[model samples]
Target chain A: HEAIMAILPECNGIMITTRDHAGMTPSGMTFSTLAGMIPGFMGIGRTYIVSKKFISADGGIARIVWMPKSLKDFLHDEFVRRSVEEGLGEDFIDKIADETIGTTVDEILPYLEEKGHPALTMDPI
Target chain B: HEAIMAILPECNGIMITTRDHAGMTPSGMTFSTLAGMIGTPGFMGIGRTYIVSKKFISADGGIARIVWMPKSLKDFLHDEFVRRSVEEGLGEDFIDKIADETIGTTVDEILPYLEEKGHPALTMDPI
Candidate 1:
């Protein structure tokens, strides 16, 4: 927590992964606990949580699931606002919109299916 | 020159590149001229100059070229000075305090103290 707090002021975003790393899974902290801290850093925008499952000896399934804080909070993040304001042209703004609004788990599934990944599905939790 | 000189007092080593970047190749200075300034910073440790070349469309070649100042000047730098000095066997010396004393000062201010602590002298400048 001390290490993370030291760097948090400088960093615009943070990603915590839970892929078989003992150091990442500290004694008292959980992944949910880490996720809860993100709002204090990034006010709005979107946050993603990724999960992986083993399908076979050599095959595995991975998915990035996203959740928004609120509909009213969309694009209200300082990072996103600064990015869009400092962007070069209208095309750059459109690109940011496409990335933030157009891209999601539902949008990504089609591309994965088009690339011939079999047995792909999004199950609601 | 002002920017380089300002950071020179703090940095242990610095690497300058001569690739296609326009900002890297400042109008008044050449790579050799920049190379001449290294000793005032690092007395005798490995310093590298990287040059890159285009080969095939997908391939490029690069090499890290090195030049040494002198063998006797080795470990004389204040950056290397406190690092080797505060090793486990050295009696009761505080590593962090030694670091605080050596860093953030001009080379001339620190060099005499480093020599007092026992590091060899360079007979002449390599340049």
Candidate 2:
């Protein structure tokens, strides 16, 4: 999971997800153009990731969070679909399930608050 | 933000965001140990961001979501702290707030899911 990454949204482009450039993916296409790839999901909230520089008991590491898109339903079914297949191993990737993906994505909100990692603060334009 | 990246939690390691590693950050450290770097906030729930493979209304892009670490508060203040400094040029870098002087350490995540599974997820243990 070290190479450049981008999640093709499940719904159409400009679904609140790919609306800003700060956190936008660099696939070099229009969100609308990449929309058809998935099924039923939209809104592309942006949050960047950088693996922390230490090790944990459960092998837990640090993760940072930035200003999230004001839009809701940031999670998409299609994004979940491809993400599972692409990363989690198609065999069990679907095992994670879409319902869970959204729930899981939402779950991290609190984690962003209580953890530690190397990241500089931004004023948010 | 290429070459594979994951935000280190602000409060500490294992701050819920990194709970499951399903959505956890892969820095290979604990939330508590990583806690000293930042000023405030806590929790470790992992949420992955994938730049949408497209441009946007305001040149905006794509990002994906997955099962987060159950603990919650996934984003680290430190990660938030260092990230800004390292990439955005906060004009400062602190211990754990620094980016390596080198390059090319990470690979792609499922074409976008870097820490999802495989070595990127397990072996290096977020190294």
Candidate 3:
């Protein structure tokens, strides 16, 4: 349950990941906990990466996966995909992408707030 | 003005600082902008370090100084320092002890501690 914050000045944002037991089987541990933690961190401009291993019942690892996506890119891609799936026109999708593509969490947070999203809470779990 | 969030599974919490002009001069620039950005970062367990320079001047005709206190520690110290300073009405001896024990007044003395703490190295200006 220990976490460390490493500043990557080169990227101009942060990467948040678990420490210690971070490599535990994904189903019962890190993934679930990180799911909750990531959003709170995202509200404050923190991005997350999950390194998960698929472990067999016999305690053998079958596969390892690494997911690294910046929040801005994640949201932009999701928004565009959803819009296209909903039969939105190219003009509309283009606008959404342009508005979101290079935005910072600082900019996105307020936009979400204006659209009625609740202000992020900082209470430790 | 641009920010990118890269997740590192190797660490928990996050490191938050400005992007782009992050290396700008300490005065009238990045430092002022980050002052506002860091509170939320701290609240979410993020830690910040400022890479500043010795060229700064203030209205008091004194050189600028940096406070390297992490937010969590800052909160604890604030509570205890205030309680001792006000509730117990301690004297200058207590003040001196707090300053001596917690604060590092010089870059030479503090740099080693900062390095041990894993903060980014201070970049010297080519002046």
Candidate 4:
């Protein structure tokens, strides 16, 4: 695992290029097992968005401007809870999530600008 | 909506037509709003599992070797299935050889591997 960890520095982002349905692969094991082991976190996308919340600078999960609609609802409750905790107001997550949907990278730029996304000013390699 | 509604009786099931990952598609709106409004189970892709089970896993020697799959599932499950099976004692080299067998491997593709491996599942009752 540590050796695999060393590989992340060079990677920008990872994407899944294939289809995944339940009981279809090792992720069937990983997601189903993890959901049970931590019942507090359920659904495929909940675990992912929360991890993002923890990692981003200034706890700026607001920087996330878009998501699949099912994923937004999947992570909806916790997203709002975390938003209020971050002092972004109770409506913040829903606002961002709705605006984020059905958009492209080019489309997301203005939303990022309006939200004061830190990535805008960050070093882009 | 009405046009698709009229055709519902003829179709057995619906599958999302294209690849979907994250924001790549608006599966959210289609699944959330459209599916919710209509009150149907989300679409399940057609034929993939049934073909795999009926033609291969349930046929005879029951997965005696690794096989090819779609690009997504191939990449997704490949590492863990390989790594774990190797740890359980299948040769990594052997697994790699069969891993390439993933493409369109419904039937004729399977028997050869089981014969080569003399796979134990040959004794099992055909499902």
- Please identify model 3 stretches exceeding 4 Å from their true place: A1-84, A87-102, A112-125, B1-73, B78-127
Q: Give the candidates in order of TM-score, highest first.
A: 4, 3, 2, 1
Docking class of 3: incorrect
- Put the candidates in lDDT order, highest first: 4, 3, 2, 1
Candidate 3, residue A94: Cα displacement in angstroms equals 5.1
Candidates' lDDT values, in order? 0.24, 0.24, 0.27, 0.33
lDDT of 4 by residue, A74-112 (tens): 667887887777777777655442323322332443565
Give per-residue CA lDDT, model 4, range B34-99, as digits (tens). Answer: 322343322233333332242433232323322322345435545654554455455554344332
Cα deviation at B42, candidate 1, in Å, is: 13
What would the per-residue lDDT of candidate 1 be over residues A1-125, giving only the tens digit for each residue?
Answer: 21111001111112222312222111112233333434212222122211122112212112111122231144234334443443422222222211233222223234434533222332210
Q: Which regions in candidate 2 have their CA more than 4 angstroms from the true location?
A: A1-16, A21-38, A42-67, A70-125, B1-127
Query: What are the per-residue Cα lDDT tens digits for candidate 3 across A2-87?
Result: 34232212122232334432332211124334444442232222221211221122111111111122322553554344445534
Ranking by DockQ: 3, 2, 4, 1
lDDT of 2 at A116: 23
Weakest 10 consecutive residues of candidate 2 chain B by summed lDDT: B56-65
Worst 10 residues of 3 chain A by lDDT: A58-67
A96: Cα error in model 2, Å? 22
Model 2, docking class: incorrect
* Kept native contacts, fraction for each prediction: 0.00, 0.00, 0.00, 0.00
lDDT of 2 by residue, A1-125 (tens): 11122221111011123433233222222334334332222333232221222112212111112212332134234334443543423232222212222222223223322332121121110
